Amino acid sequence: SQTVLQARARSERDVRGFMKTGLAAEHHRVGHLLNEFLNLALKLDWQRQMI
């Protein structure tokens, strides 16, 4: 069962690391930029070498 708790804590890690976003202006801008870019990133076919 430890692995279950490990997955749970692992997800909570990236919930915590994400809720702290009371940022200043420029940081807020680049945060939107990066988030949009990452959401774009998923769509690609990473498994492909040539991609």
Binding site: G22, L23, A24, A25
Partner: protein, 49 residues
């Protein structure tokens, strides 16, 4: 008075604005974000979780 009171509990958002009428719109934007996020409603659920 209320505006200053709010800044007393700000964290990294309202500091970038004045404390009088000309900056009220920023406070209203932040209040909109807080209300729409509805974070305070989860409290009881998340304590139990």
């Amino acid at each position: 008075k209320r505006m200053s009171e709010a800044k007393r509990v700000d964290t990294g958002a309202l500091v970038e604005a004045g404390a009088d009428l000309d900056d009220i719109p920023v406070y209203l934007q932040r209040l909109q974000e807080l209300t729409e996020e509805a974070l305070p409603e989860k409290l009881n659920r998340f304590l139990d979780y």
